[PDB]
Amino acid sequence: EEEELVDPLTTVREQCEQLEKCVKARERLELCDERVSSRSQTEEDCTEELLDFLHARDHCVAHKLFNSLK
Amino acid sequence: VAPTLTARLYSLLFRRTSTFALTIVVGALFFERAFDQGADAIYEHINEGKLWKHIKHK
Amino acid sequence: SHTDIKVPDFSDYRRPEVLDSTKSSKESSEARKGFSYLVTATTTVGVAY
Amino acid sequence: NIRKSHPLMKIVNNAFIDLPAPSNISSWWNFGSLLGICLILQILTGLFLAMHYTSDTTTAFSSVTHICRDVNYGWIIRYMHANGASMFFICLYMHVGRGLYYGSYTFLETWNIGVILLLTVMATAFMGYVLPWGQMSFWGATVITNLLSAIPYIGTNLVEWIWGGFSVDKATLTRFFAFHFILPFIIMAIAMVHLLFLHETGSNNPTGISSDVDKIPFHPYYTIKDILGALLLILALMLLVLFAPDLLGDPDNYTPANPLNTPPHIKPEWYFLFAYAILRSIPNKLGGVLALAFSILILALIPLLHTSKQRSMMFRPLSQCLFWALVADLLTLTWIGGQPVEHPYITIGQLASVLYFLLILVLMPTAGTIENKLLKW
Amino acid sequence: SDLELHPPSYPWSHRGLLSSLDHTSIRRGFQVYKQVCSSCHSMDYVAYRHLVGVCYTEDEAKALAEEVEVQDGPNEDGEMFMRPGKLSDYFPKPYPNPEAARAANNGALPPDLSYIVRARHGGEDYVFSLLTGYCEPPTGVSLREGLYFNPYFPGQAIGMAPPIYNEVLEFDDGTPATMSQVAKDVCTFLRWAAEPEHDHRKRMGLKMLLMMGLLLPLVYAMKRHKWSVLKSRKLAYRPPK
Amino acid sequence: GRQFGHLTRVRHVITYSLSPFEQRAFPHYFSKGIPNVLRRTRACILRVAPPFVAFYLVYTWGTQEFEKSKRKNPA
Ligand code: HEM
Ligand code: HEM
Ligand code: HEM
Structure with a gap:
């Protein structure tokens, strides 16, 4: 909230989010993200890029998560 | 073992359809007791929700 | 001429307890019926369950 | 003595004891008893279900939950019914297939009765699925029943007649219940007649040759092999119901019915998926249901297109390939049937549908002729 | 839009053939249900005695039931009365008819939680994925407040919120309840409410x-x-x- | 119908049998057995296998085009 519950998701997510497959995916996110902002009458909305990132991230999340959880 | 276990199983218990039926039914009882519990037991290699384990805590 | 009537060898199929022409078969009979019947008895006990 | 003479025993004796049978039948002949088994298992768990189920919209779904939570062992009974329906369909599909491959259809009466048996269980199962009154139960009840409205000048009235209302409402559930109860008994009488016509010639065998020259009594031999056979049915069934109860039903049909929703989904249970694919492959109300029907009544045309001088496929290579392409094509059909009608799926679903009919109606009979010619026959 | 994402495969303690179901977790998950989840979600196919042999003890379960109240049988006139819930009445409709959900909830209808694990693919995984994972609405996407953004949820326009926001805690044995642990437990309990x-x-x-x-x-x-x-x-x- | 003794006419064919209690139910089971299953498979693959892979391929291709289609770059 302000500071003091060590959300394991956040912790494992860091390590997870980081990683290669997601680095590249997030790159495209940012790439496309910056295009969408750079205009007006556009519609290529950056929705796809997000999921791909999440997917890559989330598979690795599942694999490393619950281990710690009590 | 020696003049054969099966041989005796046949001679003393399988030559008649009576004794045959009789052993199967007697053998049915014990088997149930042994297996039903045996399988419940093996199942105990999951010392988890194990109601007994929880019974002590609460 | 019906005397030429063989009886193909079955050694290739006979249980061991019955492989010798030299000896009786009345002996291994009990063990043989024993085994085959134990199998079916155990089965019915199984199905019964 | 007693078995042979007594009026009731004769029947049993002539059907399961001294019946001369080919010493040759393989595993593909076991589906006969297996359907018999499935039929009883489906009547027995079905009856126990009817002792707690209620066929009224407001309690329909609730009564099914009542069964799985409160009724002792209600859950197994419920899932055994559910899975036995699919088990009944796999067996039904093996059986029809077996006959097709082996020329068993040359026994017209037996076969034709078989087609009546296929239709009867399909109509039966379709009504079964509507009973829980789930999202799919209602919409599958809607989508499928509405087909009859393609029939000209009679259709509207027809659909409204069987519906009971203007939709799939109260009248429809109770209605569908009654027929789902009465149908399997009728199925039984018909299976007796199936067996009655079959007994008039005895069974066919893999060679399609003829086995009067080597018959063995149905008893040790095929009673004990059907037993082992039923045991494997139980395994498949129980493996399905205990470990994966909702596998073939898919996690979906829970959540009650809602006549205003319309889920982006809509597909009948897996056993109609091939027919489903054929129907939507055709842009046309009438044609779709016409070809829907034709995809099953075509079994009644098979014997008229036998063509080959041999009965079985055992000695016919080209025909084997064509047969396998039929089964392969039927996978595609269910696979497509289980997917939305968008880009790739339409055109192959269209192509595969034409193939289904091209295979049975033209390719298979031609191969028979070619085969005859290669053998100088 | 017909473009979406499917949940990963979490290693629950109840997946993979012969496998119990974490009962200590079903209980924490019950807590989660009663405190945070029940406010807007009905579980009308589960009663209090169902919780007996399973997680709680007989007396324990009655005490919870007792707590709040229901509209019991007719008072000798023709009006009903209130009393401490028994072990035999089902958990507790927060909204009378369906339109009450719409009213108190932006215009949306929060679906029942009796099944849900069997009524949505992936089951507990989808619920887990719907829970924990929440995201910043990307560029060109126009939320509109009523609808929040949610990866996984079809269409991405939800109506719920993330009522897992690390807390509104509880506790028996005092599990450090972050959003993760609080989510796993609900799903584990949810599995049980769907398939006892x-x-x-x-x-x-x-x-x-x-x-x-x-x-x-x-x-x-x-x-x-x-x-x-x-x-x-x-x-x-x-x-x- | 049909019975035994009214099936057909057969001449000069001897049949030797041996009682089930005097032979093994599983003689060369792995020995003779496995080669047979390999031989049966050989005999049938070329007729069973191909149709199926044709679907196997149609299946994975069919899905890729579908999934890849619900995406797009310019225009
Ligand atoms: C006359 C004998 C039968 C009786 C009394 C009977 C009874 C029932 C009842 C009461 C239901 C609703 C409860 C439920 O959905 O679990 C039901 C559902 C169903 N029935 Fe039957 N049934 C019979 C035969 C059959 C036949 C032969 C089939 C074909 C395989 C069949 C297929 C189905 C299916 C697929 C369902 C829905 C599955 C489910 O939700 O569990 N039934 N049946
Ligand atoms: C209620 C469903 C059905 C039942 C209970 C049933 C029953 C049987 C039984 C017990 C046999 C004994 C031979 C064998 O074991 O294969 C048999 C054979 C046969 N059945 Fe069915 N059947 C059903 C559905 C069908 C249908 C769908 C067909 C095809 C249209 C069919 C057509 C045939 C034919 C042609 C044979 C002769 C097989 C041969 O001699 O090779 N039956 N059926
Ligand atoms: C108490 C506060 C809550 C409110 C006001 C609420 C409200 C809602 C609403 C409005 C929806 C529908 C979303 C839509 O249709 O766009 C929904 C769906 C859902 N709710 Fe909640 N909810 C609450 C808590 C919870 C909790 C704590 C859980 C489980 C841990 C839960 C489980 C679910 C699930 C799994 C769905 C998914 C429906 C779907 O996937 O189609 N809800 N809820």
């Missing part, structure tokens, strides 16, 4: 595999034994010269 028979199912299954594994060979040996007169068998053809 879960454990026993898999117990019979163990017995079914052991028995089939013993009957199958035996029935086979019964069969080959009788078929052996035929498999081993010899033919000879002796036509007149």
Whole structure:
């Protein structure tokens, strides 16, 4: 909230989010993200890029998560 | 073992359809007791929700 | 001429307890019926369950 | 003595004891008893279900939950019914297939009765699925029943007649219940007649040759092999119901019915998926249901297109390939049937549908002729 | 839009054949249900005694039931009255008819939680994925407040919120309840509310595999034994010269 | 119908049998057995296998085009 519950998701997510497959995916996110902002009458909305990132991230999340959880 | 276990199983218990039926039914009882519990037991290699384990805590 | 009537060898199929022409078969009979019947008895006990 | 003479025993004796049978039948002949088994298992768990189920919209779904939570062992009974329906369909599909491959259809009466048996269980199962009154139960009840409205000048009235209302409402559930109860008994009488016509010639065998020259009594031999056979049915069934109860039903049909929703989904249970694919492959109300029907009544045309001088496929290579392409094509059909009608799926679903009919109606009979010619026959 | 994402495969303690179901977790998950989840979600196919043998003890379960109240039978006139819930009445509709959900909830209808794990693919995974994972609405996406953004949820426009925001805690044994642990537990309990028979199912299954594994060979040996007169068998053809 | 003794006419064919209690139900089971299953498979693959892979391929291709289609770059 302000500071003091060590959300394991956040912790494992860091390590997870980081990683290669997601680095590249997030790159495209940012790439496309910056295009969408750079205009007006556009519609290529950056929705796809997000999921791909999440997917890559989330598979690795599942694999490393619950281990710690009590 | 020696003049054969099966041989005796046949001679003393399988030559008649009576004794045959009789052993199967007697053998049915014990088997149930042994297996039903045996399988419940093996199942105990999951010392988890194990109601007994929880019974002590609460 | 019906005397030429063989009886193909079955050694290739006979249980061991019955492989010798030299000896009786009345002996291994009990063990043989024993085994085959134990199998079916155990089965019915199984199905019964 | 007693078995042979007594009026009731004769029947049993002539059907399961001294019946001369080919010493040759393989595993593909076991589906006969297996359907018999499935039929009883489906009547027995079905009856126990009817002792707690209620066929009224407001309690329909609730009564099914009542069964799985409160009724002792209600859950197994419920899932055994559910899975036995699919088990009944796999067996039904093996059986029809077996006959097709082996020329068993040359026994017209037996076969034709078989087609009546296929239709009867399909109509039966379709009504079964509507009973829980789930999202799919209602919409599958809607989508499928509405087909009859393609029939000209009679259709509207027809659909409204069987519906009971203007939709799939109260009248429809109770209605569908009654027929789902009465149908399997009728199925039984018909299976007796199936067996009655079959007994008039005895069974066919893999060679399609003829086995009067080597018959063995149905008893040790095929009673004990059907037993082992039923045991494997139980395994498949129980493996399905205990470990994966909702596998073939898919996690979906829970959540009650809602006549205003319309889920982006809509597909009948897996056993109609091939027919489903054929129907939507055709842009046309009438044609779709016409070809829907034709995809099953075509079994009644098979014997008229036998063509080959041999009965079985055992000695016919080209025909084997064509047969396998039929089964392969039927996978595609269910696979497509289980997917939305968008880009790739339409055109192959269209192509595969034409193939289904091209295979049975033209390719298979031609191969028979070619085969005859290669053998100088 | 017809473009979306499917949940990953979490390693629950109740997936993979012969596998109990974390009962200490079902209980924490019950807590989660009663405190945070129940406010807007009905679980009208589960009663208090269902929670008995499973997680709680008899007295414990009654005490929870007792707590709040329901509209019990008719007072000798024709108006109903209130009393401490017994072990026999089902958990507690927060909204009378369906339109009450719409009213108190932006215009949306929060679906029942009796099943849900069996009414949505992936099951507990989808619920887990719907829970924990929440995201910043990307560029060109226009939320509109009522609808929040949610990866996983179809269309991405939800109406719920993330009522897992690390807390609104509880506790028996005092589990450090972050959003993760609080989510796993709900789903684990949810599995149980959907499929109570879960454990026993898999117990019979163990017995079914052991028995089939013993009957199958035996029935086979019964069969080959009788078929052996035929498999081993010899033919000879002796036509007149 | 049909019975035994009214099936058909057969002449000069001897049949030797041996009682089930005097032979093994599983003689060369792995020995003779496995080669047979390999031989049966050989004999049938070329007729069973191909149709199926044709679907196997149609299946994975069919899905890729579908999934890849619900995406797009310019225009
Ligand atoms: C006359 C004998 C039968 C009776 C009394 C009977 C009874 C029932 C009842 C009461 C239901 C609703 C409860 C439930 O959905 O679990 C039901 C559902 C169903 N029935 Fe039957 N049934 C019979 C035969 C059959 C036949 C032969 C089939 C074909 C395989 C069949 C297929 C189905 C299916 C697929 C369902 C829905 C599955 C489910 O939700 O569990 N039934 N049956
Ligand atoms: C209620 C469903 C059905 C039942 C209970 C049933 C029953 C049987 C039984 C017990 C046999 C004994 C031979 C064998 O074991 O294969 C048999 C054979 C046969 N059945 Fe069915 N059947 C059903 C559905 C069908 C249908 C769908 C067809 C095909 C249209 C069919 C057509 C045939 C034919 C042609 C044979 C002769 C097989 C041969 O001699 O090779 N039956 N059926
Ligand atoms: C108490 C505060 C809550 C409110 C006001 C609420 C409200 C809602 C609403 C409005 C929806 C529908 C979303 C839509 O249709 O766009 C929904 C769906 C859902 N709710 Fe909640 N909810 C609450 C808490 C919870 C909790 C704590 C859980 C489980 C841990 C839960 C489980 C679910 C699930 C799994 C769905 C998914 C429906 C779907 O996937 O189609 N809800 N809820």
